[PDB]
Write a protein that binds this ligand. Sequence first.
Ligand SMILES: O=C(CN1CC[C@@H](NC(=O)c2ccc(Cl)s2)C1)Nc1ccc(-n2ccccc2=O)cc1F
Ligand SMILES: [Ca+2]
Ligand code: NA
Lengths: 52, 233
Amino acid sequence: RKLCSLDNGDCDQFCHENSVVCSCARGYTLADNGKACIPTGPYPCGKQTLER
Amino acid sequence: IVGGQECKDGECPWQALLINEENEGFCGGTILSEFYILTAAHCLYQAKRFKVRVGDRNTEQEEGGEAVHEVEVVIKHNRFTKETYDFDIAVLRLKTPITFRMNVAPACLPERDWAESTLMTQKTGIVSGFGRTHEKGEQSTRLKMLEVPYVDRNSCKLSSSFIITQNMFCAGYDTKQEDACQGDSGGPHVTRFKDTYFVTGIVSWGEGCARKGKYGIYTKVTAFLKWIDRSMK
Ligand SMILES: O=C(CN1CC[C@@H](NC(=O)c2ccc(Cl)s2)C1)Nc1ccc(-n2ccccc2=O)cc1F
Ligand SMILES: [Ca+2]
Ligand code: NA
C-alpha cells in the first residue's frame, strides 16, 4: 500500500507506483533492501564533495 | 547573484564557468558528466569563442584545482530563438574529459515524472554563479549560491512583460532583494532531495536583477530530459 506520496515510498531517490518501485540515478546502485541508493564511485552525481 | 552567500568549499562542485577570449566569465554551466556541460543557448551569441572552467571558487586566487577545458561540440536547441528565449538550453561536449575531484563533480539528472511530483513541488531550489551582485553592479570573484523559492506559474505570468512558455519557470522573490543576475545565465538551478542534488533549471532571464514585482526566469529542465539524453547520446 506504500505510496510515493508518503516519504517518497521510503526510496532514497526515484519512486514509482500497484506497489512502489525505487530506483536511482546513473552512478548509483539500488541496495538489496530496494530503497537505498549506493554510489559506485567517489564522485557520484549530486553529492557535494566534502571528504577527500 | 544578488544576496545569498559564498558557496562554501565543495558545496557547488557542478558549477562551471564559460570564459571569454579575454578570459572573463560571462555565463555559467552545470557539469553533467566527464564530457558534458549544460548551459543556456542564449549564452552562445554573447561570445564568438570561449572555453569552460571548473573547480574554481575564486577567479583571483589559484587554489590548485582549476582546469580549463576546450569545447569539442556545441549542441544548441534548434528551436531556441532570441525573440522568445524559449527552449533556452544547450549542451557542450568537452575535447578533454573532466577529472572529478574536490570542487569538481556532476549534478544528477532526475527521472521526469518524479522530478515533477517531487522536486518541482519543493519549496526552494538553489542557484549559483559568479555573476553580478547587484543589477548595475559587477561580477563577484567568488562563487555565490542562493536559495530561491519556486514561484507559481500564474503569478509568474502576471508579473511579466514577456511571455512565459511551458519551457520556463519562475524562482526567487517578489520584493526581497535576492536573485540571480547578469553573468549567472547558463548556470545551475538544482534541487536537493535527501542530500542529493538534481538539476531542475538553467538560469535563463530576468527583467533586471532582484526588482520588485519581478522574479528570476529559468529553463524548465523536466521538459528537456529526453533531449539532454539524446544530446549526450
Ligand atoms: O536582456 C536582459 C538583460 N537583463 C539585465 C540583467 C540580466 N538579468 C538576468 O539575467 C537574470 C535575472 C534573474 C535570472 Cl534567473 S537571469 C538580464 N533581460 C531580458 C529581458 C527579457 C528577455 N526576454 C524574455 C522573453 C522573450 C524575449 C526576451 O527578450 C530576455 C532578457 F535577457
Ligand atoms: Ca581560482
Ligand atoms: Na523580485
